Subunit: 224 residues, 4 copies
């Protein structure tokens, strides 16, 4: 199960389709507890924080099944993936701990990279990538929009010759701006809106909000 | 904030309206991790367990503001309300522990009653005379259980009486809670402590009772 | 898997509990204590997180013992509410992530209170969940009434057992901790209905006893 | 509350003393659920994972009081402080959300720096540190042993002229090798032993184990 041709990277071949959130589907912010610093700026909730956690649990189970009994090197793309990545590795460990079928291989080995995208150029702040040579690698990203970040990071990783490369992203946007790259383990498919909350930011703001929400015309102005 | 006329009980007067879940609107069970004993029987998830939790956090916040600084007696109607009740008391305690404005009264005093048509079995209610009482119920359908118990509780002379219920069904008129998580369509739900002949309580999400479920578990 | 009725209360074949030595405690000032409890809590015998870590292991032991079997778990209200809710969360999660699949639910829950119809427990595997065993009187007497209905098997899960001077003391089958003989409050444990919502297991202090007697 | 002379960095001046764990005081591993990959190696548990969580809640409350009202920039020292830092920011956000207060300022601003120490040399992998000029900065670290890493990193951060600089560390060791640096928000004071578990590693092993254990002889030999 862990094996996968390197050329399938970014194709999402053989993936389990993500949960589909239809266009214009939102919950009211007023039905949730919204902290004061966020209250003026949040109107519509796309993904309740608890719904995110439920979905991440299923993804972790899918990931556990793929890499069962294999060494798994998981890369957190900082800053955005922090929340998703921390949830995923907590579930991977717990699943492994309670599994009725045991292994002497740890559930994962964690790695961190900082990607700064300019759409154009991609900056990388990370340790040497040669460590990934011959490893099963799982890249964790918060959201895929155009696909640029993961495509060019993907080429830089293929150069060191990993054993396999897969992508986990919490959300994928349905957008005409996409280069067609898709993830292998995807939480949700959403319409083309800018989201905030649950680590998603807008100019470094709103990461601590517990739910995934849509901007607000209001908020774009005060924080642009 | 805590005072309120006893005859307002069951009217939902001045409440914050619940989250409205439109008819025929569900998540696909295949998008969630479903345990093997439930796999064959769950197809439509009405309320993900996380959505439940997020909503209960908000109700606990509304409850905390309603009884702030007041002695609050909360009654759990067993067995169905235990998961919501347990979630609610956990948020109440945490909200009070992290509050700026401090207090010497505990966040709640807990009490338990059970079901028998079923009615509540509640060992000597005279301890509720002159107390602020909050009754916690898993779901309100016809409103019979809460109406019948509410009359018996009124008889001991509580200081106030309010209802928290996770879900209220839209069914043909009717008793309403004060702190209500969700308004849903008139369907039978299982999971998250909701049962169908004692089955499905431990499933983590709120699902619609399927045909397969009904046929397998019908008494 | 399931066992002789006469072994009830003996803890026969059990895994001994974590043994907390006499006079061993944490300082309450190292923890966050809410204002209603702060005047009264000084010594923490069991941090709430240690209770949760230990309940995880007991739930795993219970999962193993009843694997594949229909398990009816009885919660002795009100004190056992915290422990029982922890236990059933873990039992369900362990089953859900096991992957070593089973069609029976992880448990069927049941509730009893202190001063009902036990007939439903005839021919059932029963686990009685109790918050703490002190003299053992509560579980001895309840056990005799449950034995009268003819359960298939009976075992006891108790979060704590006190070390008393009593001989032939009732022992549980899945026990979290052995502690010194002192009154404890917090984590659902009470003193005249006070302190249940505090997050940690504390020793009842003199101030607490005098204030809440 | 949040102001403090830059010269006091590393002195733990005016701090709330940590929980003191006496020498040779531990829990037995058999009383906990230990996953198959760790089972042969864990004997002694110094700090159950749940005791860590309860302690970090108190430390989060202390931090919350210290920076109440101000903009707090908290830096996660990768990789070891990942789990501590994640717990910390969860608590800070939850504390603020439930507070009587109605702040308009977010509970924190997150930042990540990977440090690699050689006792010597210190490699700093991060985004530009000059964004911390005139900010209240809290450095989050997993454990202070010699104090070398935080002394050297402290000097590199003083060069951008932060408004204040404090240190949160989950554990500090009672050692002979220490240069005397001590943290301002410290969870525990422990005897001088190597610890693994709860993100603490021994050559990149054991991070996912849920409890803080002492490195055993079986672990050393196996992972030396
Ligand atoms: O809706 C959004 N909210 C917050 N960040 C986003 C959003 N969409 C894209 N991004 C950011 O842009 C990066 C990837 O964009 P891509 O390279 O166009 O696929 C993510 O890793 C995020 O940092
Ligand atoms: O859809 C359902 N699923 C599970 N239990 C239900 C459902 N609808 C009603 N009940 C049970 O019926 C009891 C009382 O309903 P009511 O008295 O008609 O309002 C509730 O306390 C529930 O536990
Ligand atoms: O130290 C204690 N704190 C709180 N309740 C206790 C304590 N010791 C005994 N109890 C209560 O007394 C009952 C057990 O007493 P026993 O029958 O003497 O074993 C339990 O149901 C508890 O709820
Ligand atoms: O007992 C230990 N277990 C795991 N890592 C440790 C231990 N002691 C020190 N370290 C690592 O060594 C780094 C440097 O500690 P220093 O000696 O104070 O510079 C810390 O940030 C830890 O990551």
């Amino acid at each position: 199960m862990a094996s996968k041709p390197i050329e399938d990277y970014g194709k999402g071949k053989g993936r389990i389709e993500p949960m589909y959130i239809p266009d214009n589907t939102f919950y009211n912010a007023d039905d949730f507890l919204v902290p004061p610093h966020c209250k003026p700026y949040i109107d519509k909730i796309l993904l309740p924080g608890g719904l995110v956690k439920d979905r991440v649990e299923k993804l972790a189970y899918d990931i556990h099944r793929t890499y069962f009994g294999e060494e798994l090197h998981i890369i957190c793309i900082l800053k955005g993936s922090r929340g998703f990545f921390n949830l995923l590795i907590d579930y991977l460990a717990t699943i492994q701990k309670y599994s009725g079928r045991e292994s002497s291989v740890p559930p994962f080995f964690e790695h961190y990279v900082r990607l700064k995208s300019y759409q154009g150029q991609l900056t990388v702040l990370s340790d040497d990538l040669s460590i990934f040579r011959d490893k099963h690698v799982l890249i964790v990203e918060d959201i895929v929009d155009t696909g640029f970040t993961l495509t060019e990071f993907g080429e830089r990783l293929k150069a060191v010759g990993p054993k396999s490369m897969r992508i986990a992203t919490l959300v994928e946007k349905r957008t005409d701006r996409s280069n067609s790259l898709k993830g292998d383990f995807v939480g949700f498919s959403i319409e083309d809106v800018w989201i905030v909350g649950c680590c998603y930011d807008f100019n470094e703001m709103f990461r601590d909000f517990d739910h995934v929400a849509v901007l607000s015309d209001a908020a774009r102005k005060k924080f642009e």
